[PDB]
Coordinates of N, CA and C and ligand atoms in Angstrom, one line a residue:
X2 N 6.9 -3.8 4.6 CA 7.1 -4.5 3.7 C 5.4 -5.0 3.2
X3 N 5.0 -5.1 2.0 CA 4.2 -6.0 2.0 C 4.4 -7.0 0.8
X4 N 3.5 -8.1 0.7 CA 3.7 -9.1 -0.4 C 2.6 -8.7 -1.4
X5 N 3.5 -9.6 -2.8 CA 2.7 -9.2 -3.9 C 1.4 -9.6 -3.5
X6 N 0.9 -10.6 -2.9 CA -1.1 -10.4 -2.8 C -1.4 -9.6 -2.1
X7 N -0.7 -9.2 -1.1 CA -1.1 -8.0 -0.3 C -1.2 -6.6 -1.2
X8 N -0.4 -6.6 -1.9 CA -0.7 -4.9 -2.7 C -1.6 -5.3 -3.8
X9 N -1.7 -6.7 -4.4 CA -3.0 -7.3 -5.2 C -4.3 -6.9 -4.5
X10 N -4.6 -7.3 -3.1 CA -5.7 -7.0 -2.7 C -6.2 -5.3 -2.9
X11 N -4.9 -4.6 -1.8 CA -5.1 -3.5 -2.0 C -5.8 -2.6 -3.3
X12 N -5.0 -2.6 -4.4 CA -5.6 -2.3 -5.5 C -6.8 -3.0 -5.9
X13 N -7.1 -4.4 -5.4 CA -8.3 -4.6 -5.9 C -9.3 -3.8 -5.4
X14 N -9.2 -3.8 -4.3 CA -10.3 -2.2 -3.7 C -10.1 -1.1 -4.2
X15 N -9.1 -0.7 -4.3 CA -8.7 0.6 -5.0 C -9.4 0.7 -6.1
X16 N -9.4 -0.3 -7.2 CA -10.2 -0.1 -8.8 C -11.8 0.5 -8.2
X17 N -12.4 -0.3 -7.0 CA -13.3 -0.4 -6.3 C -13.9 1.2 -6.0
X18 N -13.0 2.1 -5.6 CA -13.0 3.3 -5.4 C -12.9 3.9 -6.7
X19 N -12.0 3.4 -7.6 CA -11.8 4.4 -8.9 C -13.5 4.8 -9.9
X20 N -14.3 3.6 -9.2 CA -15.6 4.0 -10.2 C -16.2 5.0 -9.6
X21 N -15.6 5.8 -8.2 CA -17.0 7.1 -8.0 C -15.9 7.3 -6.8
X22 N -14.6 8.4 -7.7 CA -14.2 8.6 -6.8 C -14.4 10.1 -6.0
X23 N -14.8 11.0 -6.5 CA -15.1 12.3 -6.1 C -16.5 11.2 -4.5
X24 N -17.4 10.6 -5.0 CA -18.2 10.0 -3.6 C -17.4 9.1 -2.5
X25 N -16.5 9.0 -3.3 CA -15.9 8.4 -2.3 C -14.8 9.2 -1.4
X26 N -14.1 10.0 -1.7 CA -13.5 11.1 -1.7 C -14.7 11.9 -0.2
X27 N -16.0 12.4 -0.9 CA -16.7 12.7 0.3 C -17.2 12.1 1.2
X28 N -17.1 10.9 1.3 CA -17.9 10.2 2.7 C -16.4 10.2 3.6
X29 N -15.3 10.2 3.1 CA -13.9 10.3 3.9 C -13.9 11.4 4.6
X30 N -13.9 11.9 4.2 CA -13.6 13.6 4.7 C -14.9 13.9 5.5
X31 N -16.5 13.7 5.2 CA -17.1 13.8 6.4 C -17.2 13.0 7.4
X32 N -16.4 11.6 7.2 CA -16.2 10.8 8.0 C -15.1 11.1 8.9
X33 N -14.4 11.6 8.4 CA -13.0 12.2 9.0 C -13.7 13.3 10.1
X34 N -14.3 14.3 9.5 CA -14.6 15.9 10.1 C -15.9 15.5 11.3
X35 N -16.3 14.5 11.0 CA -17.5 13.6 12.4 C -16.6 13.3 13.4
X36 N -16.1 12.3 13.0 CA -14.8 11.5 14.3 C -14.0 12.4 14.6
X37 N -13.4 13.2 14.1 CA -12.4 14.0 14.5 C -12.6 15.6 14.2
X38 N -13.9 15.8 14.5 CA -13.5 17.7 14.3 C -12.4 18.4 14.9
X39 N -11.3 18.3 15.1 CA -10.2 19.3 15.3 C -9.9 19.3 14.0
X40 N -10.0 18.4 13.0 CA -9.2 17.9 11.7 C -9.7 19.3 10.9
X41 N -10.9 19.6 10.8 CA -11.5 20.1 10.1 C -10.8 21.7 10.0
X42 N -10.2 21.9 11.7 CA -9.7 23.3 11.7 C -8.3 23.4 10.7
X43 N -7.8 22.3 10.4 CA -6.7 22.6 9.8 C -7.4 23.2 7.9
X44 N -8.5 22.7 7.7 CA -8.8 23.4 6.2 C -9.6 24.6 5.8
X45 N -8.6 25.8 6.0 CA -9.0 26.8 6.0 C -10.5 27.5 4.8
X46 N -10.6 26.5 4.2 CA -11.4 26.5 3.3 C -12.2 25.5 3.5
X47 N -12.7 25.0 4.4 CA -13.4 24.2 4.5 C -14.2 24.4 5.9
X48 N -13.6 24.9 7.0 CA -13.8 25.0 8.1 C -15.2 25.5 8.4
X49 N -15.9 26.6 7.6 CA -16.9 27.0 7.5 C -18.1 26.2 7.1
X50 N -18.0 25.0 6.8 CA -18.8 23.3 6.8 C -19.3 23.3 8.4
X51 N -21.0 23.2 8.1 CA -21.8 23.3 9.3 C -22.7 21.9 9.5
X52 N -22.9 21.3 9.1 CA -23.4 19.9 8.6 C -22.9 19.2 7.4
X53 N -23.4 17.9 7.5 CA -23.3 16.6 6.8 C -23.5 17.2 5.4
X54 N -25.2 18.3 5.2 CA -25.8 18.1 4.1 C -24.6 19.3 3.3
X55 N -24.1 20.3 4.1 CA -23.4 21.0 2.9 C -22.3 20.9 3.0
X56 N -21.5 19.8 3.6 CA -20.1 19.3 3.3 C -20.7 18.6 1.8
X57 N -21.9 17.5 2.1 CA -21.7 16.6 0.9 C -22.0 17.5 -0.5
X58 N -22.7 19.2 -0.8 CA -23.2 20.3 -1.4 C -22.1 21.0 -1.7
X59 N -20.6 20.9 -1.2 CA -19.7 21.7 -1.4 C -18.9 21.4 -2.5
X60 N -19.2 22.3 -3.8 CA -18.1 21.4 -4.8 C -16.8 21.3 -4.6
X61 N -16.6 22.2 -3.9 CA -14.6 22.3 -3.2 C -14.4 21.6 -2.8
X62 N -15.2 20.8 -1.8 CA -14.9 19.9 -0.8 C -14.9 18.6 -2.1
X63 N -16.0 18.9 -3.4 CA -15.8 17.7 -3.7 C -14.6 17.2 -4.4
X64 N -14.2 18.4 -5.0 CA -13.0 18.3 -5.7 C -11.5 18.0 -5.3
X65 N -11.3 18.7 -3.6 CA -10.4 18.5 -3.1 C -10.3 16.7 -2.6
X66 N -11.5 16.1 -2.6 CA -11.4 14.7 -2.3 C -11.0 14.2 -3.8
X67 N -11.4 14.3 -4.5 CA -10.6 13.9 -5.8 C -9.2 14.0 -5.8
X68 N -8.5 15.0 -5.6 CA -7.7 15.6 -5.7 C -6.6 14.6 -4.6
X69 N -7.5 14.6 -3.6 CA -6.4 13.5 -2.6 C -6.5 12.4 -2.9
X70 N -7.6 11.8 -3.1 CA -7.6 10.5 -3.9 C -6.9 10.0 -5.0
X71 N -6.7 10.8 -5.6 CA -5.8 10.7 -6.6 C -4.2 10.3 -6.3
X72 N -3.9 11.6 -5.7 CA -2.6 11.5 -4.9 C -2.2 10.1 -4.3
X73 N -3.1 9.7 -3.0 CA -3.1 8.3 -2.6 C -3.0 6.9 -3.5
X74 N -3.7 7.2 -4.7 CA -4.1 6.4 -5.5 C -2.6 6.1 -6.5
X75 N -1.9 6.9 -6.7 CA -0.7 7.0 -7.2 C 0.0 6.3 -6.4
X76 N 0.0 6.9 -5.4 CA 1.4 5.8 -4.4 C 1.0 4.8 -4.2
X77 N 0.0 4.0 -4.0 CA -0.7 2.7 -3.7 C -0.2 1.9 -5.0
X78 N -0.6 2.6 -6.3 CA -0.1 1.4 -7.3 C 1.1 1.4 -7.8
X79 N 2.6 2.1 -6.8 CA 3.6 2.0 -6.8 C 4.1 0.9 -5.6
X80 N 3.3 0.2 -5.3 CA 3.9 -0.5 -4.3 C 4.9 -0.6 -3.7
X81 N 5.3 0.4 -3.0 CA 6.1 0.8 -2.2 C 7.4 1.8 -2.8
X82 N 6.9 1.8 -4.4 CA 7.9 2.3 -4.6 C 8.1 3.9 -4.9
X83 N 7.4 4.8 -4.1 CA 6.7 5.8 -4.6 C 7.6 7.2 -3.5
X84 N 8.9 7.1 -3.9 CA 9.1 8.4 -3.2 C 9.1 9.8 -3.8
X85 N 9.3 9.4 -5.0 CA 8.5 10.7 -6.4 C 7.6 11.1 -6.0
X86 N 6.3 10.5 -5.5 CA 5.2 10.8 -5.1 C 4.9 11.3 -4.4
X87 N 5.3 10.6 -3.2 CA 5.5 10.9 -1.6 C 6.0 12.1 -1.0
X88 N 7.6 12.1 -1.8 CA 8.3 13.9 -1.3 C 7.1 14.7 -1.4
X89 N 6.9 15.2 -2.4 CA 6.4 16.5 -2.6 C 5.1 16.8 -1.5
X90 N 3.9 15.5 -1.3 CA 2.9 15.4 -0.2 C 3.8 15.8 1.2
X91 N 4.7 15.3 1.3 CA 5.6 15.2 2.5 C 5.7 16.7 2.6
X92 N 6.2 17.2 1.4 CA 6.9 18.8 2.1 C 5.5 19.6 1.8
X93 N 4.3 19.8 1.2 CA 3.3 20.1 1.9 C 2.5 20.3 2.9
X94 N 2.5 19.3 3.3 CA 1.6 18.7 4.5 C 2.7 19.1 5.7
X95 N 4.1 19.2 6.0 CA 4.7 19.3 6.7 C 5.1 20.7 6.9
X96 N 5.2 21.4 5.6 CA 5.4 23.1 6.0 C 4.5 23.8 5.4
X97 N 3.4 23.5 5.0 CA 2.5 24.4 4.9 C 1.1 24.1 5.6
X98 N 0.7 23.1 5.4 CA -0.7 22.4 6.1 C -0.5 22.1 7.2
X99 N 0.6 21.9 7.5 CA 1.2 21.6 9.4 C 0.3 20.7 9.9
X100 N 0.2 19.3 9.0 CA -0.4 18.2 9.3 C -0.1 17.1 9.9
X101 N -0.1 16.9 11.4 CA 0.5 15.6 12.5 C 0.2 14.3 11.5
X102 N 0.9 13.8 12.2 CA 0.9 12.3 11.9 C -0.7 12.0 11.9
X103 N -0.6 12.0 13.5 CA -2.2 12.2 14.2 C -3.4 11.5 13.0
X104 N -3.0 13.4 12.4 CA -4.1 13.5 11.5 C -4.4 12.3 9.9
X105 N -3.2 12.0 10.2 CA -2.7 11.1 9.0 C -3.8 9.5 9.5
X106 N -3.4 9.5 10.4 CA -4.2 8.4 11.4 C -5.6 8.8 11.4
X107 N -5.9 9.4 11.7 CA -7.5 9.7 11.1 C -7.9 9.7 10.0
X108 N -7.6 10.1 8.7 CA -8.3 9.8 7.8 C -8.0 8.6 7.2
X109 N -6.5 7.8 7.9 CA -6.7 6.3 7.5 C -7.9 5.5 8.0
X110 N -8.5 5.6 9.3 CA -9.3 5.5 9.6 C -10.7 5.8 9.1
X111 N -10.6 6.3 8.4 CA -12.2 6.9 7.4 C -12.2 6.3 6.2
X112 N -10.8 6.0 5.8 CA -10.6 5.5 5.0 C -11.1 4.0 5.0
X113 N -10.6 3.2 6.1 CA -11.0 1.9 5.8 C -12.4 1.6 6.2
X114 N -13.1 3.1 7.2 CA -14.3 2.6 7.8 C -15.2 2.7 5.9
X115 N -15.4 3.6 5.3 CA -15.9 3.8 4.1 C -15.5 2.7 3.3
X116 N -14.5 2.1 3.1 CA -14.6 1.1 1.9 C -14.9 0.0 2.3
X117 N -15.2 0.1 3.9 CA -15.5 -1.3 4.5 C -17.1 -1.1 4.2
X118 N -17.4 0.2 4.3 CA -19.2 0.3 4.2 C -19.6 0.1 2.7
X119 N -18.8 0.2 1.7 CA -19.5 0.5 0.2 C -19.1 -0.9 0.3
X120 N -17.9 -1.4 0.0 CA -17.2 -2.6 -0.5 C -17.2 -3.8 0.4
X121 N -18.0 -4.2 1.7 CA -18.0 -5.3 2.1 C -17.3 -6.7 1.8
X122 N -17.9 -6.9 0.7 CA -17.7 -8.2 -0.2 C -16.1 -8.0 -0.8
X123 N -15.7 -7.3 -1.0 CA -14.2 -6.7 -1.5 C -13.2 -6.5 0.2
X124 N -13.6 -6.4 1.1 CA -13.2 -5.8 1.8 C -12.7 -6.4 3.3
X125 N -12.7 -8.1 3.3 CA -12.9 -8.8 4.5 C -11.9 -8.4 5.5
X126 N -11.6 -9.3 6.5 CA -10.2 -9.3 6.9 C -9.3 -8.9 6.5
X127 N -8.5 -9.9 5.2 CA -7.6 -10.0 4.5 C -7.3 -8.3 4.2
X128 N -7.9 -8.2 3.4 CA -7.9 -7.0 2.4 C -8.0 -5.5 3.3
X129 N -8.5 -5.7 4.6 CA -8.5 -4.6 5.7 C -6.8 -4.9 6.0
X130 N -6.6 -6.2 6.2 CA -5.2 -6.2 6.9 C -4.0 -5.3 5.6
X131 N -4.4 -5.9 4.8 CA -3.5 -5.1 3.5 C -3.4 -3.9 3.3
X132 N -4.8 -3.2 3.3 CA -4.7 -2.0 3.3 C -4.3 -1.1 4.6
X133 N -4.5 -1.5 5.4 CA -3.8 -1.2 6.9 C -2.1 -1.1 6.5
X134 N -1.8 -2.6 6.0 CA -0.3 -2.2 5.8 C 0.1 -0.9 4.9
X135 N -0.5 -1.2 3.9 CA -0.2 0.0 3.1 C -0.3 1.7 3.3
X136 N -1.5 2.0 4.3 CA -1.7 2.6 4.8 C -0.5 3.2 6.0
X137 N -0.5 2.1 6.5 CA 1.0 2.9 7.7 C 2.1 2.3 6.7
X138 N 2.7 2.0 5.6 CA 4.0 2.2 5.5 C 3.7 3.7 4.6
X139 N 3.1 4.0 3.8 CA 2.4 5.6 3.6 C 2.8 6.8 4.5
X140 N 2.3 6.4 6.1 CA 2.1 7.2 6.8 C 3.6 6.9 7.6
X141 N 4.7 5.8 7.7 CA 5.7 5.8 8.2 C 6.7 6.6 7.3
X142 N 6.6 6.6 6.1 CA 7.5 6.9 4.8 C 7.6 8.5 4.6
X143 N 6.1 8.8 4.9 CA 5.9 10.6 5.2 C 6.2 11.0 6.6
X144 N 6.5 10.2 7.3 CA 7.0 11.1 9.0 C 8.5 10.7 8.8
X145 N 9.1 10.3 8.1 CA 10.3 10.1 8.2 C 10.8 11.5 7.0
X146 N 10.1 11.8 5.9 CA 10.6 12.9 5.5 C 10.3 13.7 6.0
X147 N 9.0 14.0 6.6 CA 8.3 15.1 7.9 C 9.7 15.5 8.4
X148 N 10.4 14.2 8.9 CA 11.6 14.5 9.9 C 13.4 15.6 8.8
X149 N 13.1 14.4 7.8 CA 14.1 15.2 7.0 C 13.6 17.1 6.6
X150 N 12.6 17.1 6.4 CA 12.3 18.7 6.5 C 12.3 19.3 7.3
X151 N 12.5 18.8 9.1 CA 12.8 19.4 10.0 C 11.9 19.9 11.1
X152 N 10.5 18.8 10.4 CA 8.9 18.7 11.2 C 8.7 17.8 12.1
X153 N 8.7 18.0 13.1 CA 7.8 16.4 14.2 C 7.1 15.9 13.6
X154 N 6.8 14.6 13.7 CA 5.4 14.4 13.1 C 4.2 14.7 13.7
Ligands
HEM1 C1 -4.2 10.1 2.4 C2 -3.6 11.4 2.6 C3 -3.5 12.6 2.5 C4 -3.5 12.7 1.2 C5 -3.1 12.0 -0.2 C6 -3.5 14.2 1.0 C7 -2.9 14.9 -0.1 C8 -3.7 16.1 -0.5 C9 -3.2 16.6 -1.7 C10 -2.7 15.8 -3.4 C11 -3.4 18.2 -1.9 C12 -3.0 19.5 -3.1 C13 -1.5 19.5 -3.1 C14 -0.9 19.7 -1.9 O1 -0.6 20.8 -1.3 O2 0.2 19.1 -1.3 C15 -3.7 18.5 -0.4 C16 -4.0 19.5 0.5 C17 -4.5 20.1 1.8 N1 -4.2 18.8 2.3 FE1 -4.3 17.1 2.3 N2 -3.8 14.7 2.0 C18 -3.9 13.9 3.1 C19 -4.4 14.3 4.1 C20 -4.3 15.4 5.0 C21 -5.4 16.1 6.3 C22 -5.4 14.5 7.2 C23 -5.7 16.5 6.2 C24 -6.0 17.6 7.3 C25 -6.2 17.3 9.3 C26 -5.1 17.7 5.1 C27 -4.7 18.7 4.9 C28 -4.4 19.2 3.8 C29 -4.9 20.7 3.6 C30 -5.6 22.4 4.1 C31 -4.8 20.9 2.5 C32 -5.0 21.9 1.3 C33 -6.1 22.4 1.2 C34 -6.7 23.9 0.3 O3 -6.5 25.1 0.8 O4 -6.5 23.9 -0.9 N3 -4.2 16.7 4.6 N4 -3.7 17.1 0.2

């Protein structure tokens, strides 16, 4: 559970993300793929990408990042009351894409990295802590939904 103050820090920095969703999405995916190359294997439509420049130039990857961040943003804005938004995500990621919880941990780390790289003045220790809690809640709830569907994290 996050306090109201923690949710406000989360949404304050999220507003910065919303000023350039595509750009943030690209940086997050690139960071994810560079730090954890095994994750790229899960994307049949992106695994052909060989260099950082190719990744940045991919319209398809850029569009996907907007889809990803739009979904995450919709979840965060519910401040924990996110069952309706989270359920379909768990369904697809468990039963179609087969994304282990550890990979959600990897992308969470990428999100923190990119947000701190771009907005240090609005993403200090307390804001990082809040976002970490929000992403931990997201992962915890999706893991529970995974199990409900018969998929082990
Ligand atoms: C913040 C965490 C994530 C969010 C909010 C998210 C969101 C989404 C959304 C909204 C879609 C499109 C609809 C759907 O199929 O559910 C999608 C598709 C997909 N996601 Fe995720 N995702 C996340 C993390 C991951 C991770 C870490 C991976 C891989 C390691 C992954 C792999 C995929 C794949 C392979 C697709 C299908 C892409 C395509 O071929 O069109 N997702 N994701």
